[PDB]
Amino acid sequence: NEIKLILQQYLEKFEAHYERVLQDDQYIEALETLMDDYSEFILNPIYEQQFNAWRDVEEKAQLIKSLQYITAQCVKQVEVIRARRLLDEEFGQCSITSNDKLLLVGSGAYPMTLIQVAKETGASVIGIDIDPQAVDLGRRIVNVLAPNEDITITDQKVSELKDIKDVTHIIFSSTIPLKYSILEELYDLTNENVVVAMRFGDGIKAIFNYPSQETAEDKWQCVNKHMRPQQIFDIALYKKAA
Amino acid sequence: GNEIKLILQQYLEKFEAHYERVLQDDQYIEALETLMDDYSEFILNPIYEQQFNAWRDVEEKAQLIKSLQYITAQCVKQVEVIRARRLLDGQAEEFCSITSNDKLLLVGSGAYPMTLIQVAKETGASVIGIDIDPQAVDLGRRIVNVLAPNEDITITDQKVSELKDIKDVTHIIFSSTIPLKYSILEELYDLTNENVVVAMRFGDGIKAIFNYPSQETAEDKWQCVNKHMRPQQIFDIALYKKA
Amino acid sequence: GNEIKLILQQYLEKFEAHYERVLQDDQYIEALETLMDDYSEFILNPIYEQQFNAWRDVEEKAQLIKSLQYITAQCVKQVEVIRARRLLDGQAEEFCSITSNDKLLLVGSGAYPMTLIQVAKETGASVIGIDIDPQAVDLGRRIVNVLAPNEDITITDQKVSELKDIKDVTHIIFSSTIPLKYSILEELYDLTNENVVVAMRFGDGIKAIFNYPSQETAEDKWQCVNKHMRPQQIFDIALYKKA
Amino acid sequence: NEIKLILQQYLEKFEAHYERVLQDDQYIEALETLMDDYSEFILNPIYEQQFNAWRDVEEKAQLIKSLQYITAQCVKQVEVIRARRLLDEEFGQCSITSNDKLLLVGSGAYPMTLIQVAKETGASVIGIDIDPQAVDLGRRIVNVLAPNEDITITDQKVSELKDIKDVTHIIFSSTIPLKYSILEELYDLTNENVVVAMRFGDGIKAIFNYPSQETAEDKWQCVNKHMRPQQIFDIALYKKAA
Amino acid sequence: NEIKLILQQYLEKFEAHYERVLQDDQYIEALETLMDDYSEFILNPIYEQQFNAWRDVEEKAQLIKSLQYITAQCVKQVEVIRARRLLDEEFGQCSITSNDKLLLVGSGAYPMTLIQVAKETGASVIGIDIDPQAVDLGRRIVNVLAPNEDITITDQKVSELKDIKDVTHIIFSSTIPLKYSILEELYDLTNENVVVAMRFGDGIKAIFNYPSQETAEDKWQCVNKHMRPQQIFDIALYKKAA
Amino acid sequence: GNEIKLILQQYLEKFEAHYERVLQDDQYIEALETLMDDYSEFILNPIYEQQFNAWRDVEEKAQLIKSLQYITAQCVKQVEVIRARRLLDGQAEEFCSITSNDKLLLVGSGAYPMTLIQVAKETGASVIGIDIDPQAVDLGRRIVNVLAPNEDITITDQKVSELKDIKDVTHIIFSSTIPLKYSILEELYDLTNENVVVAMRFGDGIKAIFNYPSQETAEDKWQCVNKHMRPQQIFDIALYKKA
Amino acid sequence: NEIKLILQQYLEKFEAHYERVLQDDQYIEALETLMDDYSEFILNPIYEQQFNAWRDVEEKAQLIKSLQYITAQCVKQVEVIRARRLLDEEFGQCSITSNDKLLLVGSGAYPMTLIQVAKETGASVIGIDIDPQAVDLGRRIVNVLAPNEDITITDQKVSELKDIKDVTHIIFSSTIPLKYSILEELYDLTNENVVVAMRFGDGIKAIFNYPSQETAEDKWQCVNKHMRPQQIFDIALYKKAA
Amino acid sequence: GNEIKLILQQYLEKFEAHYERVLQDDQYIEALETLMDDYSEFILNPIYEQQFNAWRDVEEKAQLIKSLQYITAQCVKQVEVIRARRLLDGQAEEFCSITSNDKLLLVGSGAYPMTLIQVAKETGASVIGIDIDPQAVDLGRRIVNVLAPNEDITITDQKVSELKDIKDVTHIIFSSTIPLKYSILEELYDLTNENVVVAMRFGDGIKAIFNYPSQETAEDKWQCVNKHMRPQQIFDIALYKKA
Ligand SMILES: Nc1nc(Cl)nc2c1ncn2[C@@H]1O[C@H](CSCCN[C@@H](Cc2c[nH]cn2)C(=O)O)[C@@H](O)[C@H]1O
Ligand SMILES: Nc1nc(Cl)nc2c1ncn2[C@@H]1O[C@H](CSCCN[C@@H](Cc2c[nH]cn2)C(=O)O)[C@@H](O)[C@H]1O
Ligand SMILES: Nc1nc(Cl)nc2c1ncn2[C@@H]1O[C@H](CSCCN[C@@H](Cc2c[nH]cn2)C(=O)O)[C@@H](O)[C@H]1O
Ligand SMILES: [Ca+2]
Ligand SMILES: [Ca+2]
Ligand SMILES: [Ca+2]
Ligand SMILES: [Ca+2]
């Protein structure tokens, strides 16, 4: 009972903060505070166990779907504003080095992950994003924070990437709704030895993430699933079936 | 590939426009019904199915499927309402396995509940319809009073957990256009007697643009015991019993 | 004896008055329908049946039966018309033996042909309704268009000899309230294929006051192969095949 | 085809003559002439065979029922007017003598048959009729044409006849619609040795008569059926089953 | 007259064949032929109408009672021998499906009906019989012809059936003399919505069946009576009065 | 329940044994008569009646009733024969409505026809006794010659259809222990005059173990006009006249 | 890997049991047990999913073709031996009644399906089979189990059936290799309103059945496909294109 | 009709006999080769093709096609072996699109791999032959050493999944007489680079008696981009690229 009203309250605030933040930029501090609060809520064992206990399976879905939608849009808005203001253990043995090439799907307006991996690894990195504003801001952020690195950001779809066969590692942003549809597309486009990290969130985490899914055993094999109690998203590693 | 995509986009745009038009004027219903007839012919045409299956832009295809199944579910609801209003105004297969000692629940009964009425008259079974939309319940009840006043038909806006008699239900039918139908199936497990049979209406592949698809179930709970693929009908049927 | 006679006389007088009233004002229909409900309860009450069977004034009983079956046949026709008009205005078991490859003829389809519509929807068979009254054909056709426009239903005012397709008819149903139904059965012999089955609706004894009775047939032509006596329904059924 | 239009023409004339004869008595001569014409039509082998050949079984019935109705009423009207103006081989071995008692059902306003049998046989005769005018006229005719004979005419139903058990012979007028219903009633009312002559007409004769019927073999046994090509009605003899 | 001598001849043969079949099994073929002959006799419209015409009501009863007795015993003997050698439209809308439970009273040594309904419907079926030999043979036949089906055969009386309240449909063998006494007992034992099919035979059929009876309108209501000219037994359907 | 059942079983076994014994030796008659006295006291005891009515094993109760009414009917016949033989050897309420102008038929007159003799002497009526058993006729005739030689009593072994004078019979009495008495009543309808009155002896409930029960009649033929329930006598009486 | 060795083991046993059963009849019990085992294997979700997962598409084909061949021959042998020892919801609205006529292609030596439909429906039934021994045994079985029914068994090809145009329903045995070639032939031979039920098995079921095929949209339209998880064969319904 | 059937039966019987004879004596090879020449002329004769297409016994035709394509595939294999043995003993169009930078795989290389040798010498491409029959590999290798020792030709008995270099293959050719060639095509999809081109040899209609036919492919995988029907050659060619 309690969980439903918290989720409802969250959804209300999120939709308001979003509309207010799109109307005026100074609402960013409040939205960030809400997001920190939300993150703490999700990772708190009380609320996580209460969410799972709630067995109104139908009723939970509409809040989940609503929240995952509005939060994804809020995260994008935070990144855009942050950008304008400024202006591999997960992989284990399959980690990234200077001889590798990383594609990030959903690079974002403030592409910190992309810059971070490029600086530490030396690897060539490619980010794609469907939102042209995110591509524009992301590129400009790269020019300021990592101009010497080999980072390319584009609005190209995976099937338009001329160098897709040379990619060794792929990371998916969690807040991409059709991320498994893209993964399916990538099977034919990629070399045999590629490794994919799918960010996801299941259970209560699905209110701030898109969930995991079962994949066709004939294409992509899940080789690892990493559950991170202190992180807002978990990671699943996929390799092509041999 | 590109032709299927363009056709789907065109249908998507037309359905969205027709929805708005019919919401502000019920007299545009005949254009919606015609569009829906055209859509059905496209879906049931084996050439279009083959080419839809050939299209390789998985992401674009998923986005169009998701958008179309949503807008088409709402248009179907509106057609049912307008049809019910017109008959009342005067401007007008799942399972024999159901008998008169049985009790059928139909989830998503609709404003024009002809399926409900047909089961009652043909079988003599007790029939319950539920709908989440109260307008559909109200119109549905009035349709039942006009066409089948002496049959044992109850239409309510109760959730499955609220139903007093849920343990005595022998048969359940899900409307295809219910998004969360498999989540409801999961909840029904503990609510129902051991011998209940569920007919899940669905559409996969090209049929998923006018239907919600089938899903895997938990095999310790529900078992698919029968599947009817119907190449000339807009939805297929899967039967489930408890494991 | 005397009590049954008085009751029958009272019903006769009331039916004649109600007929006149409804002919000059369709808004008195609810009183006729109520009277008919009351009549049905009387007929299906086993105490009244026993006492009707006990009454020994054969001649008086025959006169009342003949008068009642006539006036009640006309009242039933009027009820069907008014019901059809009201649904259209917006002021609102025989044989499985019939399949979709079959073809049913119903003699006396009526202005509110629900039986016709039910056979079509449940079986998928081709269905023909005939009626001698053109108003019943017209209203019947319009009812069919409203409720079952996509089914293969034809309603006409043709006699059985005029029907182009009479040789392809697999099943025939007679309305109970047709006076000359057995004479029609006789004519159908040469018009129909060897395997046709006929369901004759009838009522004998007390039921003959709201129905035309069964009759002996020529045994070289038609043979009774089945008879269903239904103590809680207003008419019984006899099945005939060719000898 | 031809027969249907003759029957239609007959029905039309009959209904007119009836209405005209009820409005004014001087139309009697015309109605009598029509009835003589009708009788000749029925007994003529052409029309009799044409009637039987007509296989519109449904269509024939409505004309029959109509004609038999209107003609029965015309015969009564002729008898009434005739009365006012004035004012046993069939049985064979079971014939009527002076020691017998005859009941005629449907004695009529001009009860010639009743007077005729009474004068020839010496038998006591009783006539009944449902029409009080026919009883009144019939009695008065008897007083004029056979006052010395033992003839009683009454409006009593068979079940009200105190002397019904002493009746030896019963004759039914053909134009009584429910004559077989009366016959069924008579089984319990009559002695064991009674004989009944049922006047009837089948085929074309049914347009001027009510037809014969099958009887319950357990009560009344048909012992003879007399077909008379030159008579408007035929005769069936019934005795109680032994 | 003729009917009485046929019935007498039948009774004589039946009593002989029975005694001979109990003495030696090889007489079964002759008894079967007699039973086929008898069945054809009963369903033949000549003999059926002659039987009804015979109005020696007292005399008919002793032959009926005798025949119905001897024939019932012959049918049992046929079933026993058949067994050893080997070793729902009636209901209409109230038909049997896989979720129903059927009790047959008088299951017999060769329980074909029980196996037949179980295989077609999927319903759980229970047969009872008073004759322990019939229970023993019936069970063994089931094990051979339908081992996977849910069929239980027992010598329990209806009042000893622990699952009687879950029964949805009941069928009575016609050749049970006190079948209506059992029906009366079942009213208290059964659920509200049960449907009963009483096999019976009236008229000539009563020489191979026990007859129908009027029931207490307060308990069991006859809802249908099915007369089957080409079948040795008819069916009456009963439901509890509402 | 169980006690009544055991008592009935014990009486059944004892009656069967006593029948056999008396058939092979008429000197065991006194034991049969004593058993029958005991049986009568059991039947007429209102405590046993109440508990018999309480017993709920309808089938078992019906079987015992049927077996007892049969064996007791034969024992009663044998007692009558032995009583008649002993008087001859020298080793020894229904209707005033009967008058000397009347004529009584008693169906089942018996070997010791005291009822017959009593009606004749008290009323002066003409009396006919019939019995299906010729030994009963013979002994009955000889008893009548000894005790009432000057009365108008005829005993024959004719069926009711064979009686010359059946139309002149004013009164009829049926013995209770005749199995097919109501079927005979049905046949008598057409054989008898309009004013005949029939006294049917019967026993229902507990009394049905020593009697054949009453039955419904066809109401168009025979009408019950009077019923005498006699708590201290072994049979009750119902009077019938023609409807 | 595991599936291939099971299939190999099955094939070995099947070929042995077949050769042994053709040499001596007493091996029938073992072959039946093997067939029950095989049926359970095919319908078990583990083995069905393992079969589909095996992506040695070439290698699977030789085992399939081999198994479907040997099993078809074993089924025939079982039916022959069974025969010698002894000696419509699928259609839905298009079901079989007494006025219909059914042709079964591949009637078999023990034609239970043919007898079953004939007894329940009243329909006239025709079975054909290419194997003369199956025709001979099938006819003889019919004479014993259903002599009164209208069942004709012949070795005629579809094109030699004089009454083929009056057939309303056709059922194909699954184990007929060229069943779709026969279906193509039937288009010209049959009336317009005929309905065909093609028994088939796809996936793992193809090891005990011949598979489904795509048909010429211009002739036969698939109107229904019935997948039956608990049955060794599935059903496809075909009607002529309008 | 009957003539085509008889001819086919005669060829079937002759091929089966010749196979046996050549297996037990390689000196009967000239009779087999002559029969095969005759068969080719029959297949390529447009009159025989028309009449084969006219024959309406679909089932009989299918059985003969299936039997002939099997026995003829084995005879062709034997001819290749005997030809290879005789040359060694001393008793003796698909695609320019192939260049020296390319790499061709031929599935079903055969014991006398002249096609392989011709591609290598004319194009300068690297060539791989595979065969499932090890005798064909051995003889094929020895033929290549005799006639083309300096070309880059490798013949192996590896399946397509075993080939180290399968990703570098630019061109693939299937022998027509491989039964499961389209199933192999399906497996090659994931094994090969994006730009591979496949030449599928086939024969349909009359040509299917000496060849395996073409098939529909999954349109999301392989697309027919070109088809060459050759009325004077024993097999046709279809080219496939990835969708
Ligand atoms: N969670 C939920 N619970 C309940 Cl009780 N009802 C729900 C629900 N989600 C939605 N509904 C209700 O479903 C109604 C559907 S009416 C259209 C029927 N159309 C056929 C054929 C068809 C298939 N494709 C298109 N039409 C069908 O959907 O099977 C509609 O009135 C809507 O208010
Ligand atoms: N000769 C003839 N030929 C044809 Cl083609 N039609 C004829 C006809 N004679 C009359 N009719 C037509 O029959 C119609 C009957 S509508 C009432 C149905 N009611 C049920 C239940 C019922 C039983 N009792 C009361 N209602 C029934 O009658 O079975 C009526 O519209 C009338 O115009
Ligand atoms: N169908 C039939 N027709 C005729 Cl003419 N007679 C028939 C008959 N069936 C049987 N009988 C004869 O009836 C005689 C009965 S002597 C016992 C009288 N006892 C009293 C009091 C009584 C009641 N309960 C026990 N005793 C009574 O039964 O009323 C017996 O001799 C038997 O041969
Ligand atoms: Ca049920
Ligand atoms: Ca049919
Ligand atoms: Ca007196
Ligand atoms: Ca190149």
UniProtKB/Swiss-Prot annotation, chains A, D, E, G:
Domain of life: Bacteria
GO BP: nicotianamine biosynthetic process
Disruption phenotype: Cells lacking this gene produce neither staphylopine nor the biosynthetic intermediate 2-amino-4-{[1-carboxy-2-(1H-imidazol-4-yl)ethyl]amino}butanoate. They also show a decrease in the intracellular content of nickel, copper, cobalt, iron, and zinc.
InterPro entries associated with the record: Nicotian_synth (IPR004298), SAM-dependent_MTases_sf (IPR029063)
EC number assigned by the record: 2.5.1.152
Induction details: Up-regulated in metal-poor media.
Listed GO MF terms: nicotianamine synthase activity
Residue ranges of the TM segments: none
Keywords, sorted A to Z: S-adenosyl-L-methionine, Transferase
Reaction catalysed by this enzyme: D-histidine + S-adenosyl-L-methionine = (2S)-2-amino-4-{[(1R)-1-carboxy-2-(1H-imidazol-4-yl)ethyl]amino}butanoate + S-methyl-5'-thioadenosine + H(+)
Function: Catalyzes the nucleophilic attack of one alpha-aminobutanoate moiety from SAM onto D-histidine to produce the intermediate (2S)-2-amino-4-{[(1R)-1-carboxy-2-(1H-imidazol-4-yl)ethyl]amino}butanoate. Functions in the biosynthesis of the metallophore staphylopine, which is involved in the acquisition of nickel, cobalt, zinc, copper, and iron, and thus enables bacterial growth inside the host, where metal access is limited. Therefore, this enzyme probably contributes to staphylococcal virulence. Appears to be specific for D-histidine as substrate.
Family: Belongs to the methyltransferase superfamily. CntL family.
Stated name of the protein: D-histidine 2-aminobutanoyltransferase
Organism: Staphylococcus aureus (strain Mu50 / ATCC 700699)
Gene this chain is encoded by: cntL
Curated annotation (Swiss-Prot), chains B, C, F, H:
GO BP annotations, alphabetical order: nicotianamine biosynthetic process
Superkingdom, taxonomy of origin: Bacteria
Keywords, alphabetical: S-adenosyl-L-methionine, Transferase
Top-level EC class as recorded in UniProt: transferase
Knockout-associated phenotype: Cells lacking this gene produce neither staphylopine nor the biosynthetic intermediate 2-amino-4-{[1-carboxy-2-(1H-imidazol-4-yl)ethyl]amino}butanoate. They also show a decrease in the intracellular content of nickel, copper, cobalt, iron, and zinc.
Stated induction or repression of this protein's expression: Up-regulated in metal-poor media.
Record bears the keyword Repressor: no
Record-listed E.C. numbers: 2.5.1.152
Catalytic reaction equation(s): D-histidine + S-adenosyl-L-methionine = (2S)-2-amino-4-{[(1R)-1-carboxy-2-(1H-imidazol-4-yl)ethyl]amino}butanoate + S-methyl-5'-thioadenosine + H(+)
GO MF term set: nicotianamine synthase activity
The family this protein is said to belong to: Belongs to the methyltransferase superfamily. CntL family.
Function noted in UniProt: Catalyzes the nucleophilic attack of one alpha-aminobutanoate moiety from SAM onto D-histidine to produce the intermediate (2S)-2-amino-4-{[(1R)-1-carboxy-2-(1H-imidazol-4-yl)ethyl]amino}butanoate. Functions in the biosynthesis of the metallophore staphylopine, which is involved in the acquisition of nickel, cobalt, zinc, copper, and iron, and thus enables bacterial growth inside the host, where metal access is limited. Therefore, this enzyme probably contributes to staphylococcal virulence. Appears to be specific for D-histidine as substrate.
Protein name (database record): D-histidine 2-aminobutanoyltransferase
Naturally occurring in which organism (per UniProt): Staphylococcus aureus (strain Mu50 / ATCC 700699)
Recorded name of the encoding gene: cntL
